């Protein structure tokens, strides 16, 4: 079907997140979430490799013009030259309903066109 809207949110960094060595210990990145609109927006934070990542908040409702920091952190591993990792991370959002009497409700009567998502890319540099 046809997606109701584009994504609404503002992200920074928009296209790549990256990940600098060296990787001995948990390096973290942040992902802010901007909401330009006048409308509530609840998001979801979505991953390829969640047993690498932990990332707080991994979901929450941004206020008209509010602005929220998603720390991303990358666990510790040890370089292995035969691994080909391409991570991505996805924001997925909605708008909330006027109406709608609590967060839960937003996603469990959504509909595939009104969720807009937005893509990633993990980029490790030693």
Known sequence: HMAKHEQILVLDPPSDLKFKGPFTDVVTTNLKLQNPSDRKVCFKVKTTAPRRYCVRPNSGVIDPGSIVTVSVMLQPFDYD?????KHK???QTIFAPPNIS???????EAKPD????SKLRCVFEM
Request: charge should be negative.
């Open 102 to 108: 609590d967060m839960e409700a937003v996603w469990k």
């Open 114 to 117: 009104e969720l807009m998502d």
């Open 89 to 91: 991370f996805m924001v």
């Open 81 to 85: 030259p035969n691994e080909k990792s």
